[PDB]
Each structure stands twice: as structure tokens, then as C-alpha cells.
Design a protein around this ligand. Structure first.
Ligand SMILES: Nc1ncnc2c1ncn2[C@@H]1O[C@H](COP(=O)(O)O)[C@@H](O)[C@H]1O
Ligand SMILES: OC[C@H]1O[C@H](O)[C@H](O)[C@@H](O)[C@@H]1O
Length: 454
């Protein structure tokens, strides 16, 4: 059948199957996203005030973290020039102060765990248990109403309650999101693709703080979940990763023992040592999700300089280079499923076979389109409505390269024993913002694929 027909069948199947998932554990990063829609002249003026030469310097080479305003604006410009996503820790208090005064346009739920919780529980109706480092009033009320739960303790036993029911009022953890559209101008520079740069400005998610409830009472909490999605390790450094990693590994031991598939959402991990340590534990995960920037950063530490460069080229990055990169990652770690997403198409390399892998990708692509249009999804219907968004044209050539190289048919093929699944995506011409679309894509496909096996 045609791609349009495949999309249609996929959403109809998912609308029925997804709601059957009994429960999903989500951790560990949840925060408040302060989203700013960049303005050309405002940014140009600020770049000159900060020191333009330094700003340009950092737009050519991203720093490991942000300690100055020139580093912040230069990192934003880095993303603008390449039309690629990046995120760095704002270590400087003066810079965070500068960001607070600079402001934002809207406040939204942020973080892999937080965003996925609102989607799966708040929209899909799938019960979820989410880890929230700091449950401030603002944080709790950014959670949608529905089967979303956080663990608490009343007399030695776990009591699951909606975030809004939490009696405390902890700290507001803010991350600033700098969004820019395709064609955004800054002096002679022009954004080749709509994207954003993130300056994380809290001191809880950045150290991968994990609540007492998720420590040794974790077994009780996950008794009724069927899947788990973990993320947040991206902010750690060679100086503070040890302790958090041991907690995560303990959680993974419990999850693996109960045979609960776990998916890791990779994110921009600046510290090369931590990036390597994540790979060292990937074999404990059933699945992993990532974009072109993230896959490139992995190739970088694996010595694949060529693949890294190709994965950072203009959209759409070469699908063969991506597939070869995924093969290297799978062989190295033993992860069972790798879901790659980029602008124009998604790919999924799995050690097992099945059209349900491709169909789950199609479901996720529709969710991505809906999210791109409204900034936030309200219902499964909005996802179904996204079928009217045309499949992007450039994906035709991408599919052809894959067919010629691996012989994929209707998006499915095989390479070295693994199944390689491909789908051309539905790109929204004038998206509101880009932050969180990746999370929508990865979580929807992971839960969707699993739901298809029920
Ligand atoms: N205008 C758009 N329409 C549909 N999908 C989009 C659009 N802009 C970005 N995306 C998708 O959302 C993702 C954001 O990636 P990431 O920042 O890695 O989570 C990309 O990999 C694309 O698949
Ligand atoms: O995927 C979007 C999310 O990415 C990272 O988790 C950022 O820290 C967070 O601010 C953002 O909401």
C-alpha cells in the first residue's frame, strides 16, 4: 500500500491499542520550561552587548557549559547556524539572572519524564508513575489531569497520588528554551531549519537528583508498570556522575528482573566521559531513542569521525551513514532497539522483526505533526487529524538510497540480521515550536510498538 494508507492503518490501530497499556514508569528529569521565541534585532543587540567576537567563537565551537553571556548567546547562535538542537548547563548565577530578565513567552511542562508523562497519561490515558525532582506548586499544576502519579509514603507503604495532590511545595526548576523558525536571521546568518537551544538553569535535574521514594521503595512503585522510559543522565559530568549512576543501575536491575522493557532517551551529553558511561550501561536497556546530533556525538567517542560529520550535515542527513552508525551502536552495546529521528524521516534498527516497529513509527510521526502545529497535544483525535499533513518530498530520495543499499520494501528491510525500518515523515510548514517533539516521537513509538504486541 501507499504511505498514506499505511499511516491511516497505523493511527487506527494505535488509537485502539495504546489505551490498553497498563502502566509506564517515567524518570528522572521533570522541570519547568520557559520558552522564548527569539527576535532577530533583539538578539543582534544582545550579541554586541555581550561581546560579538566571543559569541561568534562559541557559535563555531560549542562550550562544555555556559559561564558567560557571550557563551550563552554563542551557543544559541551555534544552534541557529546549523539548524540543530543543543543543550548546555548554565553554571553561572549572573547568566541565569540575565536569562530571567531576558524573559520568555510561555511556561510549559519540561523534561523528558515530565513531557512524556503529560502525553502518555494526560493525552493517551495510559497510567504513569513519574519522577519529579522538585514538586513546586507551579511544577505540579503543569501536569495534566488524568492517570498521572507520583509516589509518597504514608506509614511504610507507597501511596500513589496525582502531582497536584502533593502536600509540599518544593523549588521551581527552570530551563530556558530559545526557539527560532526556519530562516531566522542574525546578522549574516540564517537558520537552515527550525530548532532551539536549551540553557538548563536548575540545580536538581542537573545533578540527576533522585527522590527517596525511587530509591529502595522503587520495587513497590513499579509493581504494576509494563514499560519504563528513563532519561536525564545527559546533564551529568565526570565530576558527579558516579552516585546517580549507581541509583539508576539499581533501578535497572529491578526493572530487568521483572522483565519490564526499558527505553533510554538519549539527549545532548556534552561530557564525553559521561556519554561513554551511558554507552557502557546501554546493554541494560531494551531500547534507545536519539536524533542526528546525539548519534553523531556517540560516533565521535567511538572514533567514527566520518559518520559523525555526516550526521551533522544539512537535512536530511544521509540514511546510510545513519544506519551504519546505528549498527555500530547496537554491536557495541547490545541494545535491542534503536529509534532514530531527524527532520524528514525516522529509522528503527531492531534485533527482532515485525511490521509493528514501522507502524509505531508512523503513529509517532503523526503525534509529532500534531505537536508541531499546536505546541501541545490535547487528544488522540488531534493526532488522527494530522494525517492531512503531507509527507515531505525530500524523503523520497532518502527512501531510494535505503532501497538501493538495503532493499527496504514499504519501509522494511534487513541488514546483518537486524531489521531496518524507515518512514517518510509529515512535516508541518509553520510549526509553533520544536522543544519536546523528540520526546513525543520516542515515547509514542515505544509505547505504541509495545501496545501492538498486546
Ligand atoms: N516542522 C516540523 N514538523 C514535523 N516534525 C518536526 C518539525 N520540526 C521538527 N520536527 C521533528 O521533531 C524532532 C525534534 O528533534 P529533537 O530536538 O532531537 O527532539 C526532529 O527530529 C523532527 O523529526
Ligand atoms: O526534550 C525537551 C527537554 O529536553 C531536556 O530534557 C531539557 O532539559 C528540557 O528543558 C526539555 O523540556
Amino acid at each position: 500500500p501507499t504511505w498514506e494508507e499505511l499511516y491511516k492503518n497505523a493511527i487506527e490501530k494505535a488509537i485502539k491499542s495504546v489505551p490498553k497499556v497498563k502502566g509506564v514508569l517515567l524518570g528522572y528529569n521533570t522541570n519547568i520550561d520557559a520558552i522564548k521565541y527569539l527576535d532577530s534585532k533583539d538578539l543582534e543587540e544582545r550579541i554586541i552587548k555581550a561581546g560579538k567576537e566571543e559569541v561568534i567563537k562559541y557559535s563555531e565551537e560549542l562550550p562544555d557549559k555556559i559561564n558567560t553571556v557571550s557563551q550563552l548567546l554563542g551557543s544559541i547562535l551555534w544552534s541557529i547556524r546549523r539548524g540543530k538542537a543543543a543543550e548546555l548547563f548554565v553554571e553561572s548565577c549572573p547568566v541565569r539572572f540575565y536569562m530571567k530578565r531576558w524573559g520568555w513567552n510561555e511556561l510549559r511542562m519540561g523534561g523528558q519524564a515530565g513531557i512524556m508523562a503529560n502525553l502518555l497519561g494526560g493525552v493517551y490515558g495510559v497510567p504513569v508513575i513519574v519522577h519529579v525532582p522538585q514538586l513546586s506548586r507551579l511544577q505540579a499544576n503543569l501536569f495534566l489531569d488524568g492517570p498521572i502519579y507520583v509516589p509518597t509514603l504514608e506509614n511504610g507503604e507507597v501511596k500513589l497520588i496525582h502531582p497536584k495532590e502533593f502536600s509540599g511545595d518544593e523549588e521551581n526548576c527552570i530551563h530556558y528554551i530559545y526557539e527560532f523558525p526556519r530562516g531566522f536571521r542574525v546578522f549574516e546568518f540564517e537558520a537552515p531549519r527550525e530548532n532551539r537551544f536549551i540553557g538548563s538553569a536548575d540545580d536538581y535535574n542537573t545533578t540527576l537528583f533522585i527522590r527517596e521514594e525511587f530509591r529502595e521503595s522503587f520495587s513497590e512503585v513499579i509493581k504494576n508498570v509494563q514499560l519504563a522510559i528513563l532519561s536525564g543522565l545527559q546533564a551529568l559530568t565526570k565530576e558527579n556522575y558516579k552516585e546517580p549512576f549507581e541509583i539508576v543501575k539499581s533501578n535497572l536491575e529491578v526493572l530487568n528482573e521483572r522483565e519490564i522493557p526499558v527505553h533510554l532517551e538519549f539527549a545532548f551529553t556534552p561530557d564525553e566521559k559521561v556519554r561513554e558511561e551511558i554507552l557502557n550501561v546501554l546493554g541494560m536497556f531494551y531500547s534507545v531513542g536519539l536524533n542526528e546530533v546525539e548519534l553523531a556525538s556517540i560516533m565521535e567517542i567511538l572514533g567514527e569521525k566520518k559518520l559523525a560529520k555526516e550526521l551533522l550535515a544539512h537535512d536530511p542527513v544521509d540514511p546510510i551513514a545513519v544506519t551504519e552508525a546505528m549498527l555500530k551502536l547496537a554491536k557495541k552495546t547490545g541494545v535491542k532497539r534503536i529509534h532514530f529521528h531527524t527532520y524528514g524521516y525516522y529509522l528503527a534498527l531492531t534485533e527482532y522483526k515485525g511490521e509493528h516497529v514501522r507502524d509505531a513509527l508512523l503513529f509517532a510521526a503523526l503525534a509529532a505533526a500534531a505537536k508541531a502545529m499546536k505546541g501541545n497535544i490535547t487528544s488522540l483525535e488531534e493526532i488522527r487529524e494530522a494525517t492531512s499533513v503531507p509527507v515531505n518530498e525530500k524523503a523520497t530520495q532518502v527512501e531510494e538510497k535505503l532501497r538501493a543499499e538495503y532493499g527496504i520494501k514499504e519501509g522494511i528491510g534487513e541488514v546483518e540480521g537486524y531489521q531496518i525500518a524507515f518512514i517518510p515523515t509529515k512535516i508541518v510548514a509553520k510549526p509553533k515550536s520544536t522543544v519536546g517533539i523528540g520526546d513525543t516521537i520516542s515515547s509514542s513509538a515505544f509505547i505504541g510498538e509495545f501496545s501492538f504486541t498486546l
